[PDB]
Sequence to fold (26 residues):
Amino acid sequence: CKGKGAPCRKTMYDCCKGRCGRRGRC
Fold:
């Protein structure tokens, strides 16, 4: 999974601390 504050993938909610944000970061 991704990390909070780190640029996640605009694919889905891969963030380990929530979902991806519109700003490109979780």
Summary: The CA atoms of residues 7 and 25 lie 4 Å apart. The radius of gyration is 7 Å. DSSP finds no helices and no strands in the chain. Residues 1-26 form one domain.
